[PDB]
């Protein structure tokens, strides 16, 4: 499913855009990914027109699928 993608690449987390692979999403709050996934996304139906339980629950597991918190590429050279 790429509405997922969609859904946090709308605004839920953040990734290095000069190291490709590193990412870290808003770290304090990982919920907010989820909330914040279902705000655009109920802010804008998605073609999948998936629900949004699912969407921001998918959300929050792909979120948690990158385990990404930080660029350690930024130091990698
Ligand atoms: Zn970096």
Do not use: A, G, S, T
């Given at each position: 499913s790429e509405a997922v993608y969609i859904a946090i690449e709308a605004g839920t987390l953040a990734e290095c855009?000069?190291?490709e692979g590193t990412y870290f999403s808003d770290s304090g709050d990982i919920s907010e990914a989820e909330e914040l996934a279902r705000e655009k996304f109920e802010k804008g139906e998605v073609s999948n027109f998936?629900?949004?339980?699912?969407?921001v629950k998918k959300v929050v597991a792909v979120c948690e699928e990158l385990g990404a918190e930080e660029c350690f590429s930024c130091d990698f050279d």
């Open positions: 855009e000069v190291h998936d629900d949004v339980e699912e969407l």
